[PDB]
mmCIF file of C-alpha atoms in Angstrom:
data_model
loop_
_atom_site.group_PDB
_atom_site.id
_atom_site.type_symbol
_atom_site.label_atom_id
_atom_site.label_comp_id
_atom_site.label_asym_id
_atom_site.label_seq_id
_atom_site.Cartn_x
_atom_site.Cartn_y
_atom_site.Cartn_z
ATOM 1 C CA UNK A 1 103.069 81.368 100.247
ATOM 2 C CA UNK A 2 100.219 79.710 98.992
ATOM 3 C CA UNK A 3 96.947 78.653 101.340
ATOM 4 C CA UNK A 4 93.824 76.589 100.661
ATOM 5 C CA UNK A 5 92.719 73.656 102.741
ATOM 6 C CA UNK A 6 90.700 70.825 101.852
ATOM 7 C CA UNK A 7 88.020 69.137 103.860
ATOM 8 C CA UNK B 1 80.081 88.812 89.288
ATOM 9 C CA UNK B 2 79.222 89.047 92.728
ATOM 10 C CA UNK B 3 80.926 85.192 94.211
ATOM 11 C CA UNK B 4 79.239 83.986 97.560
ATOM 12 C CA UNK B 5 81.739 81.497 99.050
ATOM 13 C CA UNK B 6 78.943 78.734 100.634
ATOM 14 C CA UNK B 7 80.794 76.509 97.973
ATOM 15 C CA UNK B 8 84.772 76.739 96.515
ATOM 16 C CA UNK B 9 85.252 79.954 94.624
ATOM 17 C CA UNK B 10 85.732 77.466 90.725
ATOM 18 C CA UNK B 11 85.863 79.529 87.628
ATOM 19 C CA UNK B 12 86.438 79.009 84.093
ATOM 20 C CA UNK B 13 89.663 80.580 82.873
ATOM 21 C CA UNK B 14 91.698 80.049 78.941
ATOM 22 C CA UNK B 15 94.673 79.550 79.270
ATOM 23 C CA UNK B 16 97.364 79.022 75.849
ATOM 24 C CA UNK B 17 94.775 77.818 74.241
ATOM 25 C CA UNK B 18 92.685 75.913 76.810
ATOM 26 C CA UNK B 19 90.215 75.834 79.175
ATOM 27 C CA UNK B 20 90.567 74.817 82.383
ATOM 28 C CA UNK B 21 89.081 75.055 85.643
ATOM 29 C CA UNK B 22 90.722 77.246 88.542
ATOM 30 C CA UNK B 23 89.993 78.258 92.467
ATOM 31 C CA UNK B 24 89.835 81.687 93.321
ATOM 32 C CA UNK B 25 92.278 81.936 95.726
ATOM 33 C CA UNK B 26 93.131 85.145 98.039
ATOM 34 C CA UNK B 27 95.602 82.411 100.638
ATOM 35 C CA UNK B 28 97.465 82.450 97.615
ATOM 36 C CA UNK B 29 100.333 84.995 96.168
ATOM 37 C CA UNK B 30 100.546 83.224 92.911
ATOM 38 C CA UNK B 31 98.591 81.530 90.169
ATOM 39 C CA UNK B 32 100.101 77.702 89.976
ATOM 40 C CA UNK B 33 98.247 75.803 87.442
ATOM 41 C CA UNK B 34 99.076 72.382 86.117
ATOM 42 C CA UNK B 35 99.492 71.091 82.792
ATOM 43 C CA UNK B 36 99.311 73.523 80.363
ATOM 44 C CA UNK B 37 102.267 74.100 77.525
ATOM 45 C CA UNK B 38 102.954 77.554 77.444
ATOM 46 C CA UNK B 39 105.152 79.151 74.715
ATOM 47 C CA UNK B 40 107.500 81.964 75.433
ATOM 48 C CA UNK B 41 110.399 81.461 78.019
ATOM 49 C CA UNK B 42 110.525 80.810 81.354
ATOM 50 C CA UNK B 43 112.533 80.593 84.760
ATOM 51 C CA UNK B 44 112.402 77.949 87.460
ATOM 52 C CA UNK B 45 110.691 79.445 90.467
ATOM 53 C CA UNK B 46 111.275 77.697 93.865
ATOM 54 C CA UNK B 47 106.886 78.056 95.738
ATOM 55 C CA UNK B 48 105.542 75.810 99.258
ATOM 56 C CA UNK B 49 108.951 75.368 101.445
ATOM 57 C CA UNK B 50 106.332 73.204 104.117
ATOM 58 C CA UNK B 51 108.246 69.820 103.735
ATOM 59 C CA UNK B 52 110.668 71.244 101.025
ATOM 60 C CA UNK B 53 109.984 73.367 98.151
ATOM 61 C CA UNK B 54 108.647 72.247 94.848
ATOM 62 C CA UNK B 55 109.875 73.725 91.858
ATOM 63 C CA UNK B 56 108.115 75.100 88.802
ATOM 64 C CA UNK B 57 108.300 76.885 85.725
ATOM 65 C CA UNK B 58 107.461 80.831 86.152
ATOM 66 C CA UNK B 59 105.527 82.285 82.597
ATOM 67 C CA UNK B 60 105.787 85.812 82.569
ATOM 68 C CA UNK B 61 103.294 88.553 81.336
ATOM 69 C CA UNK B 62 100.564 85.480 80.085
ATOM 70 C CA UNK B 63 97.496 86.938 78.868
ATOM 71 C CA UNK B 64 94.610 84.664 80.061
ATOM 72 C CA UNK B 65 90.907 84.957 80.125
ATOM 73 C CA UNK B 66 89.525 84.697 84.099
ATOM 74 C CA UNK B 67 85.777 84.462 84.130
ATOM 75 C CA UNK B 68 85.388 86.333 80.927
ATOM 76 C CA UNK B 69 88.125 88.950 82.074
ATOM 77 C CA UNK B 70 91.104 88.876 78.796
ATOM 78 C CA UNK B 71 94.375 89.762 81.217
ATOM 79 C CA UNK B 72 97.731 89.796 81.801
ATOM 80 C CA UNK B 73 99.622 87.833 84.557
ATOM 81 C CA UNK B 74 102.957 85.549 85.657
ATOM 82 C CA UNK B 75 101.606 82.055 85.887
ATOM 83 C CA UNK B 76 103.466 79.331 87.017
ATOM 84 C CA UNK B 77 103.665 75.827 86.011
ATOM 85 C CA UNK B 78 103.577 73.005 87.902
ATOM 86 C CA UNK B 79 102.130 69.955 89.322
ATOM 87 C CA UNK B 80 99.420 71.720 91.660
ATOM 88 C CA UNK B 81 96.474 69.143 93.879
ATOM 89 C CA UNK B 82 94.084 72.056 92.275
ATOM 90 C CA UNK B 83 94.455 74.966 89.567
ATOM 91 C CA UNK B 84 94.944 78.009 91.532
ATOM 92 C CA UNK B 85 93.845 81.996 90.830
ATOM 93 C CA UNK B 86 96.537 83.725 93.395
ATOM 94 C CA UNK B 87 95.969 87.342 93.987
ATOM 95 C CA UNK B 88 98.622 88.405 91.626
ATOM 96 C CA UNK B 89 95.750 87.620 88.968
ATOM 97 C CA UNK B 90 92.719 88.826 90.701
ATOM 98 C CA UNK B 91 94.234 92.396 91.189
ATOM 99 C CA UNK B 92 94.033 92.823 87.663
ATOM 100 C CA UNK B 93 90.331 91.555 86.853
ATOM 101 C CA UNK B 94 89.680 93.602 89.618
ATOM 102 C CA UNK B 95 88.830 91.590 92.188
ATOM 103 C CA UNK B 96 87.691 92.478 95.647
ATOM 104 C CA UNK B 97 86.541 91.223 98.811
ATOM 105 C CA UNK B 98 83.423 92.783 99.738
ATOM 106 C CA UNK B 99 81.617 92.261 103.191
ATOM 107 C CA UNK C 1 84.817 97.230 103.519
ATOM 108 C CA UNK C 2 85.825 96.419 99.893
ATOM 109 C CA UNK C 3 89.397 94.938 100.421
ATOM 110 C CA UNK C 4 91.416 95.114 97.646
ATOM 111 C CA UNK C 5 94.325 92.135 97.011
ATOM 112 C CA UNK C 6 97.634 94.074 96.392
ATOM 113 C CA UNK C 7 98.272 92.605 99.515
ATOM 114 C CA UNK C 8 97.524 89.555 101.685
ATOM 115 C CA UNK C 9 94.147 90.145 103.355
ATOM 116 C CA UNK C 10 95.092 90.199 107.037
ATOM 117 C CA UNK C 11 92.370 91.351 109.064
ATOM 118 C CA UNK C 12 91.501 91.646 112.944
ATOM 119 C CA UNK C 13 90.047 89.373 114.762
ATOM 120 C CA UNK C 14 88.515 88.706 118.592
ATOM 121 C CA UNK C 15 88.571 85.577 119.528
ATOM 122 C CA UNK C 16 88.606 83.864 123.216
ATOM 123 C CA UNK C 17 88.717 87.660 125.160
ATOM 124 C CA UNK C 18 92.015 87.910 122.698
ATOM 125 C CA UNK C 19 92.674 89.948 120.420
ATOM 126 C CA UNK C 20 94.235 88.234 116.643
ATOM 127 C CA UNK C 21 95.029 88.361 112.798
ATOM 128 C CA UNK C 22 94.060 86.259 110.511
ATOM 129 C CA UNK C 23 94.024 85.868 106.836
ATOM 130 C CA UNK C 24 90.746 85.774 104.570
ATOM 131 C CA UNK C 25 91.431 82.687 102.482
ATOM 132 C CA UNK C 26 88.753 82.236 99.658
ATOM 133 C CA UNK C 27 91.181 78.723 99.323
ATOM 134 C CA UNK C 28 90.437 77.390 102.848
ATOM 135 C CA UNK C 29 86.899 75.435 103.462
ATOM 136 C CA UNK C 30 87.732 75.936 107.086
ATOM 137 C CA UNK C 31 89.006 78.560 109.786
ATOM 138 C CA UNK C 32 92.231 77.625 111.712
ATOM 139 C CA UNK C 33 93.569 79.318 114.287
ATOM 140 C CA UNK C 34 96.447 78.593 116.643
ATOM 141 C CA UNK C 35 97.262 80.004 120.734
ATOM 142 C CA UNK C 36 93.607 80.427 121.425
ATOM 143 C CA UNK C 37 92.285 78.950 124.309
ATOM 144 C CA UNK C 38 88.745 78.319 123.693
ATOM 145 C CA UNK C 39 86.236 76.864 126.475
ATOM 146 C CA UNK C 40 83.034 74.001 125.961
ATOM 147 C CA UNK C 41 83.448 71.083 123.930
ATOM 148 C CA UNK C 42 85.452 69.358 120.774
ATOM 149 C CA UNK C 43 86.310 66.812 118.855
ATOM 150 C CA UNK C 44 89.631 65.989 117.365
ATOM 151 C CA UNK C 45 89.447 66.712 113.348
ATOM 152 C CA UNK C 46 91.955 65.696 110.659
ATOM 153 C CA UNK C 47 92.271 68.468 108.517
ATOM 154 C CA UNK C 48 95.662 68.273 105.487
ATOM 155 C CA UNK C 49 96.406 65.127 103.827
ATOM 156 C CA UNK C 50 99.316 66.091 101.973
ATOM 157 C CA UNK C 51 102.661 64.217 103.533
ATOM 158 C CA UNK C 52 99.968 63.345 106.061
ATOM 159 C CA UNK C 53 97.019 64.921 108.442
ATOM 160 C CA UNK C 54 97.017 67.209 111.092
ATOM 161 C CA UNK C 55 95.121 66.740 113.742
ATOM 162 C CA UNK C 56 92.909 69.953 115.319
ATOM 163 C CA UNK C 57 90.259 69.949 117.848
ATOM 164 C CA UNK C 58 87.262 70.917 116.184
ATOM 165 C CA UNK C 59 85.355 73.849 118.299
ATOM 166 C CA UNK C 60 81.328 74.272 116.955
ATOM 167 C CA UNK C 61 79.584 77.364 117.014
ATOM 168 C CA UNK C 62 82.173 79.925 118.107
ATOM 169 C CA UNK C 63 81.439 83.034 118.623
ATOM 170 C CA UNK C 64 83.823 85.283 116.959
ATOM 171 C CA UNK C 65 84.479 88.967 115.841
ATOM 172 C CA UNK C 66 85.936 89.032 112.332
ATOM 173 C CA UNK C 67 86.598 92.727 110.800
ATOM 174 C CA UNK C 68 83.719 94.216 113.369
ATOM 175 C CA UNK C 69 81.169 91.628 112.621
ATOM 176 C CA UNK C 70 80.252 89.958 115.432
ATOM 177 C CA UNK C 71 79.145 86.258 113.995
ATOM 178 C CA UNK C 72 79.479 82.526 114.958
ATOM 179 C CA UNK C 73 81.043 79.105 113.061
ATOM 180 C CA UNK C 74 83.214 76.232 113.519
ATOM 181 C CA UNK C 75 86.860 77.069 114.398
ATOM 182 C CA UNK C 76 89.953 74.488 114.108
ATOM 183 C CA UNK C 77 92.201 75.614 117.195
ATOM 184 C CA UNK C 78 95.584 73.731 116.312
ATOM 185 C CA UNK C 79 99.023 74.744 114.601
ATOM 186 C CA UNK C 80 98.744 76.723 111.952
ATOM 187 C CA UNK C 81 101.533 78.316 109.579
ATOM 188 C CA UNK C 82 98.907 81.518 109.993
ATOM 189 C CA UNK C 83 95.842 82.090 111.275
ATOM 190 C CA UNK C 84 93.449 81.521 108.591
ATOM 191 C CA UNK C 85 90.024 83.054 108.146
ATOM 192 C CA UNK C 86 88.117 79.853 105.810
ATOM 193 C CA UNK C 87 85.177 80.360 103.905
ATOM 194 C CA UNK C 88 82.284 78.869 106.594
ATOM 195 C CA UNK C 89 83.253 81.757 108.070
ATOM 196 C CA UNK C 90 83.089 84.746 105.348
ATOM 197 C CA UNK C 91 80.105 83.247 104.175
ATOM 198 C CA UNK C 92 78.903 84.460 108.218
ATOM 199 C CA UNK C 93 79.956 88.089 107.590
ATOM 200 C CA UNK C 94 78.793 88.425 104.383
ATOM 201 C CA UNK C 95 81.586 88.484 102.446
ATOM 202 C CA UNK C 96 81.723 87.996 98.756
ATOM 203 C CA UNK C 97 84.405 88.258 95.769
ATOM 204 C CA UNK C 98 83.378 90.924 93.274
ATOM 205 C CA UNK C 99 84.783 91.956 90.081
#
């Protein structure tokens, strides 16, 4: 699907 | 351009008469943008799927300028933590990963 | 290498004595992998943040081969919808976006 990620 | 990845790959886009910032996201299939009021027809699309789905408006064949490249692609309009340029539009600008 | 984005940029990686598949994800800050058993010291890290946080084990300075390139970087180990190579490791392999 859609795949980011903060941190 | 060549964009290194020490920082988040955030670029300027022109969309529906507006200037916005969005993340070049190779982990994203689709392009999702918030607070844009596009003309023309749309259909609802369910995205995500973890915890539930999020409904967005799918606009097809949207003229969009991404970092100076005028292209055309599907844009999903709905609330999103970050404006995301997905693979669908990165293909159109001729964007590749290189190492 | 040059990877086009018409499909998901899934590559082979070697880590902790295992062959795995992982997504080259410029939208992700960090690298997260599941079902790996790594030796050495770790500390808990909270990631995500939508809906709550997910706790993972942070291993620093992990030797990892990504698509033929032997590098070192932080690997987060815990439950993930799919294995993700984040920017932290894409920089190490000298991966850029180009258009």
